[PDB]
Ligand binder design. Structure first.
Ligand SMILES: *[C@@H]1CC(=O)N(CC)C1=O
Ligand SMILES: *[C@@H]1CC(=O)N(CC)C1=O
Ligand SMILES: *[C@H]1CC(=O)N(CC)C1=O
Ligand SMILES: *[C@H]1CC(=O)N(CC)C1=O
Lengths: 306, 306
């Protein structure tokens, strides 16, 4: 037993990370088959990034202005094109270590692992959640753009995120692997505001179930509320409203622990109004919303991957 | 910027994990060169584990009673021996993916990554700290024994931990790769008590420096204390005493931020007596002691590995 903010094993992703240089700008790219994917602002200079005209900038570039290195092995660029906010560089070699993979656009509240990289080389791995305002609260230094986020399904990698920028507020924004930004952000250096960040209620609930599974039950109370009246309290504290799909997703956690979703909601209700009063839950003095119901089930049953 | 509890990339370790079976007991082993390392309680039955006589049990076993699988590839066991609490199985094949590696016995308070495994297959990765009482607070289910903890130094893996058992209290105990337990635990199913768990003061201090680096400075106060008088407060709250080596290790964090170690100690002093009063620091409502000074420097400068 025990409970940890666990990330997916990163081995299959390490072998896909390359270093992309264009001009004096260097960042990370993702090498699958014979295509290298990277942020298109790699073609920007320091001055260009305030008001970049990407089509006009991309015109001045030819295949040989792009240097791609995979460790010590040089790749040769044969074609290049812009798909939304990512560049696709066709190279002469297919990545031998290309894993079975898929591109996926995740939804707010889902979780994934980030492999933070510099100069094409892997630095560290952490788990995080797509916030409801389509940002992530990550850990990125200069040079980490093109680092990717991913899930693993047995032997299959699902790439869902590419890092593009840090907002003046210290949070992080990026795209899917087709280059569409998550959220209303653009790849230019201007003031851009994220919305109100809210708490992911269904994840908190999944975490309470994890805590019951692991011996923390002090917060269980003898009260039963309704969905309307919980959501009425939820909205007051900047919590995402709970819907029926959310209750359905929690069904197996309900079944394994004998506690109805609505009863768990009533416990959360009380913590929101009264607080935790110094106590802790699974080690934490705050409510935690970076585990999905699937994460809890995976962790508490020991799902593995190739 | 930002700050995350980051783990090391696990790729180099994934390729070393095999599945070891003896009788009906299956667990994980570590395959480096032509030796497989695993917990010796693999040779125990369900009844044996209360009062195991390992030498007498190991006598009834021969090379062919040990089945080692690396994915679908079977390994053949040629020799076998017991070194303290680990078994060493000599196999006929050297692991092709053997990375440059070293065995190391870490000290309490150092951190490392755990690759949690089942049936020889990688499940997930998390960072943790060796507590001062030589336990770790991990996330392990039945079948995870022989999972290992490790650090990476550029292209070199430092194995420091092998998982052996969960205590009746829900915490986790294990050995180095030479089979010596960390702490006074034995590999038998009896009540074993860990000592008092204390907080790792030098790590907390490193984390305060990280927080100053990332914009959290509300806890900075205009007070200066002495080492004796801080330690006198430290011991009252179950904090590890601070020594001069500890102050020396923090020197570069002091230099980069302009804040003297002793001044930071005085800030911590106040949080210990007064609390955080609802506020948070780097996202957390508790003081955090699972980052070493080296972790903070690595994260805040973007150190990478092969
Ligand atoms: C993994 C491998 C693959 O092609 N798929 C299809 C959806 C996977 O899920
Ligand atoms: C990594 C590779 C190796 O043999 N060493 C010696 C200490 C390392 O640090
Ligand atoms: C990485 C991401 C980013 O914004 N830059 C500046 C050009 C990088 O190099
Ligand atoms: C893994 C670790 C442990 O104690 N067991 C029971 C025999 C395992 O199989």
């Amino acid at each position: 037993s025990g409970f940890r903010k666990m990330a997916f094993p990163s081995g299959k992703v390490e072998g896909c990370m390359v270093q992309v240089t264009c001009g004096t700008t260097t960042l990370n790219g993702l090498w699958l088959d014979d295509v290298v994917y990277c942020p298109r602002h790699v073609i920007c200079t320091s001055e260009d990034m305030l008001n970049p005209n990407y089509e006009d900038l991309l015109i001045r570039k030819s295949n040989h202005n792009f240097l791609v290195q995979a460790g010590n092995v040089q790749l040769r660029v044969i074609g290049h094109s812009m798909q939304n906010c990512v560049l696709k560089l066709k190279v002469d070699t297919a990545n031998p270590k290309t894993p079975k993979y898929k591109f996926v656009r995740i939804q707010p509240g889902q979780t994934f692992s980030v492999l933070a990289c510099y100069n094409g080389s892997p630095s560290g791995v952490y788990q995080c959640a797509m916030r409801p305002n389509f940002t992530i609260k990550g850990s990125f230094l200069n040079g980490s753009c093109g680092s990717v986020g991913f899930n693993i399904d047995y032997d299959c990698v699902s790439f869902c995120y590419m890092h593009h920028m840090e907002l003046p507020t210290g949070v992080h924004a990026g795209t899917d692997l087709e280059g569409n930004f998550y959220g209303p952000f653009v790849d230019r250096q201007t003031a851009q505001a994220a919305g109100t960040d809210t708490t992911i209620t269904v994840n908190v609930l999944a975490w309470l179930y994890a805590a019951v599974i692991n011996g923390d039950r002090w917060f269980l109370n003898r009260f039963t509320t309704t969905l309307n009246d919980f959501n009425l309290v939820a909205m007051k504290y900047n919590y995402e409203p709970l819907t029926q799909d959310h209750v359905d997703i929690l069904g197996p956690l309900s079944a394994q622990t004998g506690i109805a979703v609505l009863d768990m909601c009533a416990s959360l209700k009380e913590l929101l109004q009264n607080g935790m009063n110094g106590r802790t839950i699974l080690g934490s003095a705050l409510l935690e919303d970076e585990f999905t119901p699937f994460d809890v089930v995976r962790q508490c049953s020991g799902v593995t991957f190739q």
